Design an enzyme around this catalytic site. Structure first.
Site, PDB file in Angstrom:
ATOM      1  N   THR A 239      -4.810   6.277   8.943  1.00  0.00           N
ATOM      2  CA  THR A 239      -5.460   6.380   7.838  1.00  0.00           C
ATOM      3  C   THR A 239      -5.626   5.354   7.074  1.00  0.00           C
ATOM      4  O   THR A 239      -6.363   5.235   5.774  1.00  0.00           O
ATOM      5  CB  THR A 239      -5.062   7.400   6.648  1.00  0.00           C
ATOM      6  OG1 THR A 239      -3.548   7.832   6.482  1.00  0.00           O
ATOM      7  CG2 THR A 239      -4.764   9.173   7.923  1.00  0.00           C
ATOM      8  N   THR A 240      -5.164   4.566   7.838  1.00  0.00           N
ATOM      9  CA  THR A 240      -5.217   3.118   6.594  1.00  0.00           C
ATOM     10  C   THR A 240      -6.007   2.175   7.744  1.00  0.00           C
ATOM     11  O   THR A 240      -5.287   2.115   8.889  1.00  0.00           O
ATOM     12  CB  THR A 240      -4.182   2.249   6.201  1.00  0.00           C
ATOM     13  OG1 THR A 240      -2.796   2.341   6.995  1.00  0.00           O
ATOM     14  CG2 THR A 240      -3.534   2.728   5.456  1.00  0.00           C
TER      15      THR A 240
ATOM     16  N   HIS B 139       6.147   7.110   5.977  1.00  0.00           N
ATOM     17  CA  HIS B 139       6.141   6.367   4.314  1.00  0.00           C
ATOM     18  C   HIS B 139       5.433   7.509   3.364  1.00  0.00           C
ATOM     19  O   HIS B 139       5.122   8.630   4.519  1.00  0.00           O
ATOM     20  CB  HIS B 139       5.323   5.305   4.603  1.00  0.00           C
ATOM     21  CG  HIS B 139       4.171   5.426   5.198  1.00  0.00           C
ATOM     22  ND1 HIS B 139       3.844   5.310   7.235  1.00  0.00           N
ATOM     23  CD2 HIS B 139       3.174   6.091   5.197  1.00  0.00           C
ATOM     24  CE1 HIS B 139       2.596   5.508   7.206  1.00  0.00           C
ATOM     25  NE2 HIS B 139       2.031   6.498   6.000  1.00  0.00           N
TER      26      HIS B 139
ATOM     27  N   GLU C 139      -3.597  13.033   2.405  1.00  0.00           N
ATOM     28  CA  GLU C 139      -4.516  12.700   2.652  1.00  0.00           C
ATOM     29  C   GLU C 139      -4.986  13.988   3.345  1.00  0.00           C
ATOM     30  O   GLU C 139      -6.239  14.143   3.086  1.00  0.00           O
ATOM     31  CB  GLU C 139      -4.001  11.660   3.804  1.00  0.00           C
ATOM     32  CG  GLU C 139      -3.342  10.472   2.689  1.00  0.00           C
ATOM     33  CD  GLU C 139      -3.620   9.088   3.678  1.00  0.00           C
ATOM     34  OE1 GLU C 139      -3.225   9.366   4.711  1.00  0.00           O
ATOM     35  OE2 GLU C 139      -4.350   7.986   3.582  1.00  0.00           O
TER      36      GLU C 139
ATOM     37  N   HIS D 200       0.723  -1.381   0.495  1.00  0.00           N
ATOM     38  CA  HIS D 200      -0.166  -0.030  -0.355  1.00  0.00           C
ATOM     39  C   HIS D 200       0.715   0.755  -0.021  1.00  0.00           C
ATOM     40  O   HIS D 200       0.321   2.496  -0.390  1.00  0.00           O
ATOM     41  CB  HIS D 200      -1.190   0.405   0.968  1.00  0.00           C
ATOM     42  CG  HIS D 200      -0.676  -0.539   2.648  1.00  0.00           C
ATOM     43  ND1 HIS D 200      -0.709  -1.428   2.681  1.00  0.00           N
ATOM     44  CD2 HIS D 200      -0.231   0.613   3.503  1.00  0.00           C
ATOM     45  CE1 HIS D 200      -0.026  -1.055   4.371  1.00  0.00           C
ATOM     46  NE2 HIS D 200       0.001  -0.288   4.540  1.00  0.00           N
TER      47      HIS D 200
ATOM     48  N   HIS E 165       4.376  10.814   5.719  1.00  0.00           N
ATOM     49  CA  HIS E 165       3.516  10.996   7.217  1.00  0.00           C
ATOM     50  C   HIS E 165       5.297   9.919   8.446  1.00  0.00           C
ATOM     51  O   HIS E 165       5.672   9.053   8.362  1.00  0.00           O
ATOM     52  CB  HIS E 165       2.779   9.219   7.098  1.00  0.00           C
ATOM     53  CG  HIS E 165       1.933  10.181   7.419  1.00  0.00           C
ATOM     54  ND1 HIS E 165       0.410   9.490   6.243  1.00  0.00           N
ATOM     55  CD2 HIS E 165       1.059  11.796   6.267  1.00  0.00           C
ATOM     56  CE1 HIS E 165      -0.652  10.241   5.681  1.00  0.00           C
ATOM     57  NE2 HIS E 165       0.417  11.784   6.010  1.00  0.00           N
TER      58      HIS E 165
ATOM     59  N   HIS F 129       1.861   9.159   0.820  1.00  0.00           N
ATOM     60  CA  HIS F 129       1.278   8.689   0.052  1.00  0.00           C
ATOM     61  C   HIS F 129       0.986   9.521  -1.197  1.00  0.00           C
ATOM     62  O   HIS F 129       1.333  10.915  -0.659  1.00  0.00           O
ATOM     63  CB  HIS F 129      -0.690   9.174   0.799  1.00  0.00           C
ATOM     64  CG  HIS F 129      -0.733   8.598   2.151  1.00  0.00           C
ATOM     65  ND1 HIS F 129      -1.119   7.358   2.020  1.00  0.00           N
ATOM     66  CD2 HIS F 129       0.004   8.620   3.507  1.00  0.00           C
ATOM     67  CE1 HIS F 129      -0.735   7.265   2.954  1.00  0.00           C
ATOM     68  NE2 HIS F 129      -0.171   7.936   4.100  1.00  0.00           N
TER      69      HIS F 129
HETATM   70  O1  LIG Z   1       0.239  -0.813  10.966  1.00  0.00           O
HETATM   71  C1  LIG Z   1       0.115   0.993  10.526  1.00  0.00           C
HETATM   72  C2  LIG Z   1      -1.414   0.980  10.023  1.00  0.00           C
HETATM   73  C3  LIG Z   1      -2.226   2.053   9.731  1.00  0.00           C
HETATM   74  C4  LIG Z   1      -0.819   3.164  10.320  1.00  0.00           C
HETATM   75  O2  LIG Z   1      -1.331   4.636  10.326  1.00  0.00           O
HETATM   76  C5  LIG Z   1      -0.849   5.719  10.198  1.00  0.00           C
HETATM   77  S1  LIG Z   1      -1.512   6.461   9.741  1.00  0.00           S
HETATM   78  C6  LIG Z   1       0.903   5.296  10.863  1.00  0.00           C
HETATM   79  C7  LIG Z   1       0.957   3.956  11.091  1.00  0.00           C
HETATM   80  C8  LIG Z   1       0.013   3.045  10.756  1.00  0.00           C
HETATM   81  C9  LIG Z   1       0.731   1.563  11.222  1.00  0.00           C
HETATM   82 ZN   LIG Z   2      -0.039   7.581   6.015  1.00  0.00          ZN
END
Ligand SMILES: Oc1ccc2oc(=S)ccc2c1
Ligand SMILES: [Zn+2]
Length: 257
Positions: free
Chosen positions: A195-196, A91, A103, A61, A116, A93
């Site tokens: 956000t995921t 990471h 986002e 992702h 992020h 987006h």
């Molecule tokens: O395993 C995860 C799943 C969603 C996530 O979302 C954010 S925003 C940061 C870390 C993270 C780690």
């Molecule tokens: Zn993120």
């Protein structure tokens, strides 16, 4: 299962993760005129001098640049935060086109991408415990616009060919995340979520007002990544962003006037 396609994208996530329709979901639109200056907020303390990057991973992702978080080596403190938060990974987006990808939005403006930097509160001992707490994580969000190259990003860009597909990782030592920060640490802050999936409501968001500039060639290399695994039909990893969610009963605070 979940992803960013027509049949498994953000509008479907609530079926497996009902908190998707919760009271403190992220991202949000930052309406700059209604955000209130909070003179009691502190300057942010970003202490990345001892950061130890280890690896870069395509997780299907996004790609994560991972850090050694077994000691206080790269930490975020101050601002809205109580205590010490350790950097675990960063990471991005990004979009299929320069006009989308972020986002968070600012007065409905979408940036080309969003970085992020994810940190967890040391009082909870490790990341898995921290995500179960309302103040478990602090995520530093930084917007990317397309213009001049970001020299500090190039080492990331040049390793992406080696992690093209889901599940691939590569050694990624001695990367300095200070090279991804803008000049100003002025920020907005609000309580939100991952956000995921699993979309847990455990994040203090700190979104910097000043974007960084990256070149067209740098973002084009992000868009050559794949969502799929090796030997599967090629899906380009683009538009891996969740859209803005309802603010509900939240106030966004500004560190600056
Ligand atoms: O395993 C995860 C799943 C969603 C996530 O979302 C954010 S925003 C940061 C870390 C993270 C780690
Ligand atoms: Zn993120």
């Amino acid at each position: 299962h979940w992803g960013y396609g027509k049949h498994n994208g953000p509008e479907h996530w609530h079926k497996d993760f009902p908190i998707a329709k919760g009271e403190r979901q992220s991202p949000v639109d930052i309406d700059t005129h209604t955000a209130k200056y909070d003179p009691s907020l502190k300057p942010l303390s970003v202490s990345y001098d001892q950061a130890t990057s280890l690896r870069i991973l395509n997780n299907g992702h996004a790609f994560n640049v991972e850090f050694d978080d077994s000691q206080d080596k790269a930490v975020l403190k101050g601002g809205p935060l109580d205590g010490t938060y350790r950097l675990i990974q960063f990471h991005f987006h990004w979009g299929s086109l320069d006009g989308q990808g972020s986002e968070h939005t600012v007065d409905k403006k979408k940036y080309a991408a969003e970085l992020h930097l994810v940190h967890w509160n040391t009082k909870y001992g490790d990341f898995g415990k921290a995500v179960q707490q309302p103040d478990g994580l602090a995520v530093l969000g930084i917007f990317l616009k397309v213009g001049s190259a970001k020299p500090g990003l190039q080492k990331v860009v040049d390793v992406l060919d080696s992690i093209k597909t889901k599940g691939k990782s590569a050694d990624f030592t001695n990367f300095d995340p200070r090279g991804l920060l803008p000049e100003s640490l002025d920020y907005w802050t609000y309580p939100g979520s991952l956000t995921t999936p699993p979309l847990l409501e455990c994040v203090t968001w700190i979104v910097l007002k000043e974007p960084i500039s990256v070149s067209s060639e740098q973002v084009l290399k992000f868009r050559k990544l794949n969502f799929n695994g090796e030997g599967e039909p090629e899906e380009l990893m683009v538009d891996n962003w969740r859209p803005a969610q309802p603010l509900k009963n939240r106030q966004i605070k500004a560190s600056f006037k």
